[PDB]
Design an enzyme around this catalytic site. Structure first.
Site, PDB file in Angstrom:
ATOM      1  N   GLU A 140      -9.827  -5.013  -2.852  1.00 12.88           N
ATOM      2  CA  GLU A 140      -9.034  -3.821  -2.246  1.00 12.88           C
ATOM      3  C   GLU A 140      -9.981  -2.254  -1.336  1.00 12.88           C
ATOM      4  O   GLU A 140      -9.568  -2.381  -0.367  1.00 12.88           O
ATOM      5  CB  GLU A 140      -7.853  -2.450  -3.238  1.00 12.88           C
ATOM      6  CG  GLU A 140      -7.444  -4.310  -3.472  1.00 12.88           C
ATOM      7  CD  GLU A 140      -6.171  -3.935  -3.058  1.00 12.88           C
ATOM      8  OE1 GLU A 140      -6.102  -4.160  -1.713  1.00 12.88           O
ATOM      9  OE2 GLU A 140      -5.055  -4.411  -3.623  1.00 12.88           O
TER      10      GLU A 140
ATOM     11  N   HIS B  93      -7.718  -5.259   1.250  1.00 13.81           N
ATOM     12  CA  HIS B  93      -6.639  -4.658   1.211  1.00 13.81           C
ATOM     13  C   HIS B  93      -5.498  -5.067   2.824  1.00 13.81           C
ATOM     14  O   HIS B  93      -5.774  -4.615   4.142  1.00 13.81           O
ATOM     15  CB  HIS B  93      -7.014  -3.105   1.646  1.00 13.81           C
ATOM     16  CG  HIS B  93      -5.909  -2.153   1.229  1.00 13.81           C
ATOM     17  ND1 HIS B  93      -4.909  -2.404  -0.313  1.00 13.81           N
ATOM     18  CD2 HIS B  93      -5.158  -1.279   1.395  1.00 13.81           C
ATOM     19  CE1 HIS B  93      -3.955  -1.302  -0.170  1.00 13.81           C
ATOM     20  NE2 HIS B  93      -4.034  -0.988   0.914  1.00 13.81           N
TER      21      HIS B  93
ATOM     22  N   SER C 158       0.659  -1.578  -0.031  1.00 12.70           N
ATOM     23  CA  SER C 158      -0.337  -0.282   0.098  1.00 12.70           C
ATOM     24  C   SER C 158       1.324   0.976  -0.162  1.00 12.70           C
ATOM     25  O   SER C 158       1.731   1.438  -0.883  1.00 12.70           O
ATOM     26  CB  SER C 158      -1.280   0.085   1.714  1.00 12.70           C
ATOM     27  OG  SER C 158      -2.005   0.822   1.221  1.00 12.70           O
TER      28      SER C 158
END
Ligand SMILES: COc1ccc2c3c1O[C@H]1C[C@@H](O)C=C[C@@]31CCN(CCCN1CCCCC1)C2
Ligand SMILES: COc1ccc2c3c1O[C@H]1C[C@@H](O)C=C[C@@]31CCN(CCCN1CCCCC1)C2
Ligand SMILES: *[C@@H]1O[C@H](CO)[C@@H](O[C@@H]2O[C@H](CO)[C@@H](O)[C@H](O)[C@H]2NC(C)=O)[C@H](O)[C@H]1NC(C)=O
Ligand SMILES: *[C@@H]1O[C@H](CO)[C@@H](O[C@@H]2O[C@H](CO)[C@@H](O)[C@H](O)[C@H]2NC(C)=O)[C@H](O)[C@H]1NC(C)=O
Ligand SMILES: *[C@@H]1O[C@H](CO)[C@@H](O)[C@H](O)[C@H]1NC(C)=O
Ligand SMILES: *[C@@H]1O[C@H](CO)[C@@H](O)[C@H](O)[C@H]1NC(C)=O
Lengths: 534, 534
Positions: free
Chosen positions: A326, A439, A199
């Site tokens: 996500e 995520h 990320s």
């Protein structure tokens, strides 16, 4: 020399600790300083190298975590708690950790982990980032660095040298410099350093690939659910300035000069800044963070898109990919209609609200375009379809399509690209089913948590973890995740023409092509043309 | 009275002819005049009623067809030849035909057919329009009228009373007036007249439903692959004026006044006008015709959309529908890459060219929107997908979505709506397979050609024809296609909420909902908003 746990570096001597790992042991050197504490008048400033020290630095325990916003949405819930600082917070937080196999290797592959957290939070000390399993299993020297987040790492008043912006990125670079200069003493090969992160950490990795000042400090790169061109990963210097000034306004600062503002901000206690950090965003949005990297013309010479288009970036091999869902984490926390304990079936009105929150910068025609692209008009009131549609919108717009744009641009000039799509939902996940493959939840497989019996994963989940760890470490070592001469299924190289990728799960490998092209042509080509014309 | 073939009307006496039909016979009164020949100084003028005549009008043979462009793309090929004038052309062409069951009925259901042909061609005398099968099989009095097409019927110089525009629509209205006033003498019930037509003929039907001056002349309506709001069925008075002037320019006319222009145009022979008719279109396009109805503020009081929105239209029952591949006929004739004797697999470049030709009025962003909406980005070079995608684009934009918009607007105020989707490809079709279920090819089923052995249809095609004819005639008679108390599958009423429709083919009935909603939300809501904003 004298001991396996004693290492003499160019900065001074360090004493590690022996740590148990899956019935064996390895050495761990935790909390090694790589920069001078960025405190006092140094807050917001570029980092300074750590003055070498006399005596032995005690590296047996984790360091403090940087000052950051702490999640209290679900007190005590492990799902959210596993991301929070597990050490005391402090502005004196620039340290790195090293897990070294035993016996100490001579010159082995090095992997440097860069944590995520939307550039406003994160820690190198989290249980999911424990590098002993990977270091032990794949015999690599595993390093995890730290960097300033939030205003402390990214407040940006371009033009001033007191708060230039991007200092959090400079913290990361200094640790990579320390690794380049000293990892040889821990048995690592500084010529074979792979940086990897997830990320914001993956966007960081891509930023070091782009930034000429960082390129020479690493060999290869792995990016997990993050890309440098993500819409939330950077802002213009004008927008950074606007937010720094607004922060000042929230703290009743003198706004007549950069000097007045910065001095005022420097007198505030850390928590005072954290308490109003979210008040500076320009729009009512989700997946948008206040202080992030700035396109300054220094760390980033020109716009990210022009750098990508002209090949102005480090050319090497890269391995990257995304997770199936996500967007769910972000909708749970900020979109109306979603909650942790219900299936979160979304009404049509809440879908509309979600779209608006998801693409804050879009005008009405733009919002209509998004809505149309993700609405099944034969079944528009399907609560599940609306919920999943929002999940896809948030994920495609913020993570997947930006990564796919980066992949295709990078591959034209790169030396090797491997792409994956992680879609396994862990059997012991504590988050609800509607969130899917969240995520950040491939990290535990990359760090080998499933090999730990007490964590309750299935035997196939352990097998998946081992495969992933071996893919990552073999890529770090050779620039190719595949074992030369192996009999196992081969992960195909992603090429400009075929655009192949593999799914990453407990089923037998399966190769696909053009990861979400339909949606990404909409997000990367059509929508921006629409918004720029209208 | 004296004979079955002799009928005394308010305009004079008429003598028909006895005609053989499926082993039986019926009466046919062909070529009955309903207006004064629109010749000489009357060219472009509103029609005048036919002066009654002394003696017996010989109605035993078909009348002349109106002056029109003749298709010579495939000389002798029945596929295209079946649409061409099969009688001598003449400006003296305002006649109607009546098929009357034998014995002559007393007061039976009447059906008036309005031919199509893009408002620039068409004839009431075509073999596919032979009304004897329907008149005979369903026992209805079947009427087919005629009307001026091309410049002769639609040249429009708004403001002038010499060439006001819409006179072709006024020709149709005069024939409906003649039917209202005289059909009782042929055994028809003027209180139960259903007007039906296909393509431009279906748009015409919808126009009479809208126009206050036509509403009182019929009871119910059937529209086949045509809608009044079709993008090709009407133009503004400014665009009509612009094209009338451009026609004048092509014929080296004096353009200083409407009077100068009209007089010049009136001295030209018919073929001179037809020879340059296609030179007045504003864009390089397909599915666009030069002289069509004009939104004049007289025949149409206000814009079609505002009339539709406010319910300013005749409220009665309607039965309408479309064919599966409405666009193929048009692509064959005008899009690069398509040909009668090849499968016409379309390259990506030809797809792009086709899109441009198909939506002439769209700007670049608009063209991108269309392209994206119809392109499978996982398989963009699929020649068949590109060919079929263009077929859908042309059909959705020009016929299906406009009809679906009309259906939903009409149903809010109407008294009954029945919708169909005709998707049977005739076994003896002479056009290639790639064209599918072509615009205009449900007509032969509506007129009962399949009951004729020599035409080589299958037994199931005869069954389909009989079903369709009975649906049409029962609707004409009662306002509902379903036989009261029958045991057969019921054609559901289309409602604002459920939006049900049926497929029309040789398989057992199947009911569906929201005919092509996805594409039509794009064509009716999104694209026009995009073009108006950008
Ligand atoms: C840009 O991506 C993100 C933005 C914020 C955060 C994370 C993140 O990715 C995750 C996994 C890893 O990178 C670390 C933290 C992350 C999950 C924990 N939350 C804690 C606060 C609640 N948070 C709000 C944003 C949506 C996730 C939940 C912070
Ligand atoms: C608006 O819809 C149309 C526009 C033009 C025409 C027809 C038509 O619909 C058909 C069926 C029926 O209504 C009569 C003629 C039509 C087929 C024959 N062609 C003859 C000329 C060649 N033509 C060019 C246009 C595309 C069809 C082929 C004229
Ligand atoms: C990565 O770069 C190396 C070169 O630096 C590529 O290998 C060369 O490939 C060319 C053309 O195929 C050969 O003529 C050379 O002899 C090769 N040199 C070496 C040292 O192998 C390699 O193909 C590149 N890989 C990718 C995926 O781009
Ligand atoms: C078509 O119109 C008729 C009325 O003109 C509708 O029938 C009436 O329906 C109302 C409400 O259902 C009743 O109260 C009346 O008694 C009915 N009158 C008659 C003469 O039947 C009919 O429902 C309409 N059909 C549609 C589809 O709208
Ligand atoms: C190293 O410092 C930590 C600080 O708490 C302590 O736990 C550990 O015992 C120390 N060891 C030595 C040799 O000082
Ligand atoms: C009617 O006119 C047509 C014209 O050709 C002719 O064929 C037919 O025999 C005529 N019949 C009478 C009674 O005049």
């Amino acid at each position: 020399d004298h001991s396996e746990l004693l290492v003499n570096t160019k900065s001074g001597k360090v004493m590690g600790t022996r740590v148990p790992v899956l019935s064996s042991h390895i050495s761990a050197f935790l909390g090694i300083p790589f920069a001078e504490p960025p405190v006092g008048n140094m807050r917001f400033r570029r980092p300074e190298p750590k003055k070498p020290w006399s005596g032995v630095w005690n590296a047996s325990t984790y360091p403090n975590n940087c000052q950051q916003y702490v999640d209290e949405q679900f007190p005590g819930f492990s799902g959210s708690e596993m991301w929070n600082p597990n050490r005391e917070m402090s502005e004196d937080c620039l340290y790195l950790n090293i897990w070294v196999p035993s016996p100490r290797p001579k010159s082995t592959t090095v992997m440097v982990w860069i944590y995520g957290g939307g550039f406003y939070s994160g820690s190198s000390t989290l249980d999911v980032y424990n590098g002993k399993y990977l270091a032990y299993t794949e015999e690599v020297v595993l390093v995890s660095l730290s960097y300033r987040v939030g205003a402390f790492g990214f407040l940006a008043l371009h033009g001033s040298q007191e708060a230039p912006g991007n200092v959090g990125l400079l913290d990361q670079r200094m640790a990579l410099q320390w690794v380049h200069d000293n990892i040889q003493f821990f048995g690592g090969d500084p010529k074979t350093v792979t940086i990897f992160g997830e990320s914001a950490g993956g966007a960081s990795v891509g930023m070091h690939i782009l930034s000429p000042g960082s390129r020479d400090l690493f060999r290869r790169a792995i990016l997990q659910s993050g890309s440098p061109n993500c819409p939330w990963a950077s802002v213009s210097v004008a927008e950074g300035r606007r937010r720094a000034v607004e922060l000042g306004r929230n703290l009743n600062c003198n706004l007549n000069s950069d000097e007045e503002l910065i001095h005022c901000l420097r007198e505030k206690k850390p928590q005072e800044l954290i308490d109003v950090e979210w008040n500076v965003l320009p729009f009512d949005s989700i997946f948008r963070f206040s202080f992030v990297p700035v396109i300054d013309g220094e760390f980033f010479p020109t716009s990210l898109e022009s750098m990508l288009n002209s090949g102005n970036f480090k050319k090497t091999q890269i391995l990257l990919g995304v997770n199936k869902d996500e967007g769910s984490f972000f909708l749970l926390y900020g979109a109306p209609g979603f909650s942790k304990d219900s299936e979160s079936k979304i009404s049509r009105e809440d879908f509309m609200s979600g779209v608006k929150l998801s693409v804050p910068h879009a005008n009405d025609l733009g919002l209509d375009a998004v809505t149309l692209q993700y609405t099944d008009w034969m079944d528009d009131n399907n609560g599940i379809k609306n919920r999943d549609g929002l999940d896809d919108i948030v994920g495609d717009h913020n993570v997947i399509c930006p990564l796919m744009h980066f992949v295709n641009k990078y591959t034209k000039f790169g030396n090797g690209t491997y792409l994956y799509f992680f879609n396994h939902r862990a059997s012991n996940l504590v988050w609800p089913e509607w969130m899917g493959v969240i995520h950040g939840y491939e990290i535990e497989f990359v760090f080998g948590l499933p090999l730990v019996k007490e964590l309750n994963y299935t035997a196939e989940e352990e097998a998946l973890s081992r495969r992933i760890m071996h893919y990552w470490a073999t890529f770090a070592k050779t620039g190719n995740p595949n074992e030369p001469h192996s009999q196992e299924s081969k992960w195909p190289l992603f090429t400009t023409k075929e655009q192949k990728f593999i799914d990453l799960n407990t089923e037998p490998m399966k190769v696909h092509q053009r990861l979400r092209v339909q949606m990404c042509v909409f997000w990367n080509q059509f929508l921006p043309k629409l918004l720029n014309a209208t």
